[PDB]
Amino acid sequence: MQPDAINAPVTCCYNFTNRKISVQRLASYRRITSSKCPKEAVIFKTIVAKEICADPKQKWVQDSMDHLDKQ
Known part of the structure; x- marks a missing residue:
């Protein structure tokens, strides 16, 4: 699949924000x-x-996608 993403840095989230x-x-x-x-x-x-x-599961989060995707 990938060329050699094995050396690519990996970014992860450990906690989510609580304020919209x-x-x-x-x-x-x-x-x-x-x-x-x-x-x-x-x-x-x-x-x-x-x-x-941010939590994928939260509506504010999802609606924020919608707006960035130009809705």
Whole structure:
């Protein structure tokens, strides 16, 4: 499949944020799935360039995808 992602760094989330984030401040996102991680997650990159770990299961989270996907 991959060429040789074995040397690629692996990024995982260990806890999730508890405060919802404004759509006006989210710049991007990415899904965390590597089986090397304790669990699935979403990493939101903010307008002030901060990266936050969020629960895939939360509505605010999912709706934030919708808006970034241009809804």
